[PDB]
Design a protein around this motif. Structure first.
Motif, short mmCIF file in Angstrom:
data_model
loop_
_atom_site.label_atom_id
_atom_site.label_comp_id
_atom_site.label_asym_id
_atom_site.label_seq_id
_atom_site.Cartn_x
_atom_site.Cartn_y
_atom_site.Cartn_z
N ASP A 70 -82.93 -37.95 50.80
CA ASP A 70 -84.22 -37.90 50.12
C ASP A 70 -84.03 -37.83 48.60
OD1 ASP A 70 -86.22 -37.98 52.23
OD2 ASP A 70 -85.20 -36.22 52.93
N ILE A 71 -84.07 -36.61 48.01
CA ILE A 71 -83.90 -36.44 46.56
C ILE A 71 -84.68 -37.50 45.77
CG2 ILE A 71 -82.22 -36.20 44.71
CD1 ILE A 71 -80.14 -35.74 46.89
N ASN A 72 -86.00 -37.46 45.91
CA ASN A 72 -86.85 -38.43 45.23
C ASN A 72 -87.19 -37.95 43.82
OD1 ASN A 72 -88.68 -38.43 48.34
ND2 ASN A 72 -86.76 -39.41 47.89
N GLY A 73 -87.69 -38.87 43.00
CA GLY A 73 -88.06 -38.53 41.63
C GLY A 73 -86.90 -38.77 40.67
N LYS A 110 -84.55 -31.94 44.18
CA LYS A 110 -83.24 -31.84 44.82
C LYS A 110 -83.39 -31.35 46.25
CE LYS A 110 -80.25 -31.90 41.75
NZ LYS A 110 -79.38 -32.88 41.04
N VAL A 111 -83.51 -32.29 47.18
CA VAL A 111 -83.67 -31.95 48.59
C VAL A 111 -82.49 -32.47 49.41
CG1 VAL A 111 -85.22 -31.97 50.54
CG2 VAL A 111 -86.13 -32.17 48.23
N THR A 143 -85.66 -28.65 46.04
CA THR A 143 -85.66 -28.14 44.67
C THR A 143 -86.53 -29.00 43.76
OG1 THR A 143 -83.31 -27.93 45.19
CG2 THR A 143 -84.08 -27.00 43.10
N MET A 144 -86.74 -28.50 42.55
CA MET A 144 -87.55 -29.21 41.55
C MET A 144 -86.98 -28.92 40.16
SD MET A 144 -91.28 -28.74 43.10
CE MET A 144 -91.43 -28.75 44.90
N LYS A 145 -86.24 -29.87 39.61
CA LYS A 145 -85.63 -29.65 38.29
C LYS A 145 -86.22 -30.56 37.23
CE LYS A 145 -81.45 -27.91 37.99
NZ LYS A 145 -80.97 -27.03 36.89
N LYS A 169 -88.11 -24.71 40.70
CA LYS A 169 -87.06 -23.87 41.30
C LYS A 169 -86.65 -24.44 42.65
CE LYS A 169 -88.77 -19.89 38.86
NZ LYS A 169 -88.71 -20.58 37.54
N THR A 170 -85.96 -23.64 43.46
CA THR A 170 -85.51 -24.11 44.76
C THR A 170 -86.33 -23.49 45.89
OG1 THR A 170 -83.89 -22.40 45.27
CG2 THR A 170 -83.20 -24.13 43.74
N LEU A 171 -86.30 -24.16 47.04
CA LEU A 171 -87.02 -23.70 48.22
C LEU A 171 -86.21 -24.05 49.46
CD1 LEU A 171 -89.64 -23.86 46.20
CD2 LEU A 171 -90.85 -23.92 48.38
#
Length: 129
Positions: free
Chosen positions: A51-54, A59-60, A77-79, A90-92
């Motif tokens: 995945d890891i889109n954007g 950051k998945v 995640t979202m960086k 942050k991360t999830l």
């Protein structure tokens, strides 16, 4: 009479919408290779495990320990993104405990701005630096 929006940044709606939406996507993760790897066999001949889109704003990846029952601990995640939190998302992390013979189960574990009391979603482990 003219028309237009005011809120625009309806993070509240997208928030809840993103919650349930994440469960569906993560549910597919364990359903991907019917196991719980770590993008070890992805981005090669698949279009889901990687995945890891954007533009580096998500950051998945898959994780956990399963391949017959259900034990996938996916961490997203979202960086440098622009949703939730003033700095970064942050991360999830979420977990899957379907057991491959039950009715699907879940275990939340978020790591994004947790100053208030805990509930449902716990704090992600320390993990490597």
């Amino acid at each position: 009479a003219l028309e237009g929006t005011e809120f625009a940044r309806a993070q509240l709606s997208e928030a809840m919408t993103l919650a349930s939406g994440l469960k569906t996507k993560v549910s597919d993760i364990f359903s991907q290779d019917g196991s719980c790897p770590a993008n070890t066999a992805a981005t090669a001949g698949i279009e889901k495990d990687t995945d890891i889109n954007g533009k580096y704003v998500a950051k998945v990846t898959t994780g956990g320990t399963a391949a017959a029952s259900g034990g996938c601990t996916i961490v997203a995640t979202m960086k440098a993104s622009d949703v939730a939190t003033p700095l970064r998302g942050k991360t999830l992390t979420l977990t899957l405990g379907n057991a491959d013979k039950g009715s699907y189960t879940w275990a939340c574990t978020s790591n994004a701005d947790n100053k208030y009391l805990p509930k449902t979603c716990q704090t992600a482990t320390t993990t490597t630096p």
